[PDB]
């Protein structure tokens, strides 16, 4: 996270760290129930860099804060039973449908530091996914593009209008993505960076006071560059697929 600040203890209890069991910090993710983790497909399967991880190569670390520290009597480390990648994840061009579910071997016990995020319903997506509204990104990713934090970082960012997103890049944007970040003349700055991928873009409903995961950190061109925006997977557009695999 660039231009963010330290998270408070327990501020993002759904935050998950993907960790190679060999160790290195692979990506972020989020806890959506006692047995299911949500992340970006590119964290697990990306052929251009020869990345193809299976269930036996990874560990999920939940309830963390400190990036490098094992945090006993707080974090919980779980093994994976099965990984599910969206069938139409397009790693060859776009990163279109950049989403994957991970089923844990055993349910994790919730605590003050471990608790799941909600998934949006159509009405929540309709009222909150608007240009100008801010969501929050969290992660242990790099602090600058070209440098790693000691603790979980947080930044709040505004969703950008679709025409502005489309005109900032040469990549073809789809309806399964949205972009967020400040404009060059907006004064403030901030973004996801290497290592933040797969983590959650969340918003707090003013209707029922619950936190909702609207996006998944998917890709960017550099980090915190003027005129460039962070691109996120649109969780609500892929919600039927999620519900189907979970069943």
């Amino acid at each position: 996270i660039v231009e963010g600040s330290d998270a408070e203890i327990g501020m993002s209890p759904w935050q998950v760290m993907l960790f190679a069991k060999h160790e290195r910090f692979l990506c972020g993710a989020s806890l959506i129930s006692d047995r299911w983790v949500l992340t970006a497909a590119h964290c697990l399967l990306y052929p251009p860099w020869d990345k193809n991880f299976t269930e036996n190569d990874l560990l999920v670390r939940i309830g963390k804060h400190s990036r490098t520290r094992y945090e006993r009597n707080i974090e919980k480390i779980s093994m994976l039973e099965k990984i599910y990648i969206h069938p139409r994840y397009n790693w060859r061009e776009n990163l279109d449908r950049d989403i994957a579910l991970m089923k844990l071997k055993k349910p994790v016990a919730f605590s003050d530091y471990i608790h799941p995020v909600c998934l949006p319903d159509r009405e929540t997506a309709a009222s909150l996914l608007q240009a100008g509204y801010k969501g929050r990104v969290t992660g242990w990713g790099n602090l600058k593009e070209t440098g790693q934090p000691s603790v979980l970082q947080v930044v709040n960012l505004p969703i950008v209008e679709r025409p502005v997103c489309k005109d900032s890049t040469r990549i073809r944007i789809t309806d399964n993505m949205f972009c967020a970040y400040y404009k060059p003349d907006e004064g403030k700055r901030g973004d996801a960076c290497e290592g933040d991928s797969g983590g959650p873009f969340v918003m707090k409903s003013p209707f029922n006071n619950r936190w909702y995961q609207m996006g998944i950190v998917s890709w960017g061109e550099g980090c915190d560059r003027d005129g460039k925006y962070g691109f996120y997977t649109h969780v609500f557009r892929l919600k039927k697929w999620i519900q189907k695999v979970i069943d």
Binding site: E8, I32, S33, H115, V117, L119, L128, Y133, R210
Partner: peptide, 27 residues
């Protein structure tokens, strides 16, 4: 479930340091 209600914040009616910045952007 009891999703999106944090044990150390919403459940105790305590606010984190910057959540008001989000709520103020919602109109």
């Amino acid at each position: 479930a009891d999703c999106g209600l944090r044990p150390l914040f919403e459940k105790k009616s305590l606010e984190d340091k910057t959540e008001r910045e989000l709520l103020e952007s919602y109109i």
